[PDB]
Amino acid sequence: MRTVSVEAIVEALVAEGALRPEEIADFVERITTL
Amino acid sequence: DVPSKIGTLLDLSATELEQVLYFSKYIVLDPKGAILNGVPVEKRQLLTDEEYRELRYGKQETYPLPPGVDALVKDGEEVVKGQELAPGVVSRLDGVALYRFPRRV
Amino acid sequence: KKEVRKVRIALASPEKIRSWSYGEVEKPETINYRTLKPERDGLFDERIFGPI
Amino acid sequence: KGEDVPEPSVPESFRVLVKELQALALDVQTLDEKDNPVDIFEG
Amino acid sequence: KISTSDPVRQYLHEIGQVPLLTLEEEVELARKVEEGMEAIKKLSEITGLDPDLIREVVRAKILGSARVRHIPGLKETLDPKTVEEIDQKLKSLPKEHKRYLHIAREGEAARQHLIEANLRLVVSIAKKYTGRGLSFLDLIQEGNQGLIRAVEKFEYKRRFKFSTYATWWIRQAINRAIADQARTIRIPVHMVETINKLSRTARQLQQELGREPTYIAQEPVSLETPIGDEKDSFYGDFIPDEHLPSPVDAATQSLLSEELEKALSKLSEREAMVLKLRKGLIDGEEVGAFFGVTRERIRQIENKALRKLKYHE
Amino acid sequence: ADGGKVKSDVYGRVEVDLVRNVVRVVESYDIDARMGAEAIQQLLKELDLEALEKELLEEMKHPSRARRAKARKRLEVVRAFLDSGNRPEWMILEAVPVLPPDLRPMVQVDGGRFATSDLNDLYRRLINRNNRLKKLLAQGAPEIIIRNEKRMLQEAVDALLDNGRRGAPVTNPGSDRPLRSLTDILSGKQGRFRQNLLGKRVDYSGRSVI
Hints:
The structure is cut from a larger assembly and holds 1 copy of chain A, 3 copies of chain B, 1 copy of chain D and 1 copy of chain E.
Chain A: H1 6-15, H2 21-32
Chain B: H1 6-9, H2 16-23, E1 27-29, E2 46-47, H3 49-56
Antiparallel strand pairs in B: 1-2
Chain D: H1 12-22, E1 26-31
PDB class: transferase/transcription
Keywords: Transcription regulation by bacteriophage-encoded proteins, TRANSFERASE-TRANSCRIPTION complex
Entry title: T. thermophilus RNA polymerase holoenzyme bound with gp39 and gp76
């Protein structure tokens, strides 16, 4: 199959200038679980 | 899509005859369907399960009898449109009466 | 080696659709959790599509 | 290497748009100068 | 139109035309089915053909005409040209032998009238599996796969009726498939009611205790989801990768597996296999690791096995 | 009946009565009445586009105005098929092509968590429906059951081809948001056609203040 790691993808999202580390943080936090 | 591709190619107003038959169990005739209805063979035309069941099963019918009444089971051969079968058992479907499940012999 | 000056879109006969394909997707089996590897004849088969 | 960069080959966008159209039952061929079949998937 | 009520007025309309009389009409059909059962068997002797071959020629002539060619053992045969050869070789068997046919026809046709009338049962069985992991139409069709699979087996001879005999098989094909097609991975038959059982203590502790306490199951998030200020990004867009080749997989298990069986067979098979297959084949345990010895000698021989297996003096 | 003595006149289906030793004949005949896409595949095979053009030429000009409008619009598609188009039988599928796997992948995210292209669950749904249809034909075909399953099959083809055209199919009872179909990927915000024109990120590049 195929692997991946979210910590590096999140830092890339934070660098990309989409939203602030607040919104991306809420995103990763909903990503974690419910 | 906006201009029916099949519904403009095949002949069906392009809109409902399609929606009606692909998704549901409604039906169009293809090829010779000889049997009767208010007309002969409907080469291209649509119908319901109601009038399709009157062309595959026929015209059966059920008429309940409270436990103890029985009028004309001995007339297990013949019946007309709107005939009496018991005190409160009319029969508008026109056909042949038939014994279903006896009790007293 | 040869140049591509034209593109045409047509409708594809199911006999075509079978030609482009390499084998049939048999089972609704993506991959199992135990081994991260393609299941029996699933959507991610290697014989059908190629090596991951 | 020290070489010059070659362009394609075929482009990624072109092969993908074929097979991705091909996912729906659309026969998209590529043609030569005279109408003729051209295989764009590099053997 | 919307297909929520259409299967309902499709069911409840011939189930309204045939709501089976619980004894007269129900037992009549089950008899004819078994009438057709043995009549086909007796026709298999007179003609020398497969029984399920014969039942299937009956099915084709009852429904008028279909292309449903499948048989166990035989997958196919010339359908529209040969079924009528079969029907005319049946026209030759005399008065003694054609009545088996007449009964076999009436029996399999009643089999359909049986099913078609008992589908409102399936409606109210699958109704207690609403939020389980399958759409309500997948559920009824898995339920209709069970009520069909209950018609092969029912024995009217024992007086218990079919309304309660089929609830089992229907609820057996539903719980068959919910354990299969609900999540992406083919989930264990076990973990269904292990996940379902914590979900019914979580709602019996969160009712009161207010705490989220101490002491292989999660749900997929799709690939495309607008992140950020509900913008145009899709979530696959921000995933870079770890590596392409994925080495130490095939070249490792190839050594890994073969060098296992080497030492695994060089000591006693009663020794090495107790754990080869306990820790490696299905589950785990050691309260019942024992094929019939004390819970103390298995721990004894287990450990002592590995030790001479680890290093030989 | 009796080997030749009796012969039923009316059209119908046969009942064999074993008690009163009679045969009933209830009104029906082979009524070749079909439902769903299987019917329409035939109606396209059985079609003379040459004749339909010559036909439509006449409903075009000779019937007065306010009627030929639909004839023209109907003539365009027939005349489109007759040109370098194809035969319309193709417009219904009996073979569904599967997109290659790496264009709609499945991955393993935080050690034990996955991410899924919605196409993959739409493709699994159809493998589900199609396989159950197969097994329901082998294990006896009570019609209204086989018809539900075929309905489910068309619904799941319409699903992975194009959602939102009939009400959208959802993933679970939490992300009630349409699964991304083969139609979504060829249009919309990024899609396939537009994104190439719209502009991509670029390796050998930078910013700074000037």
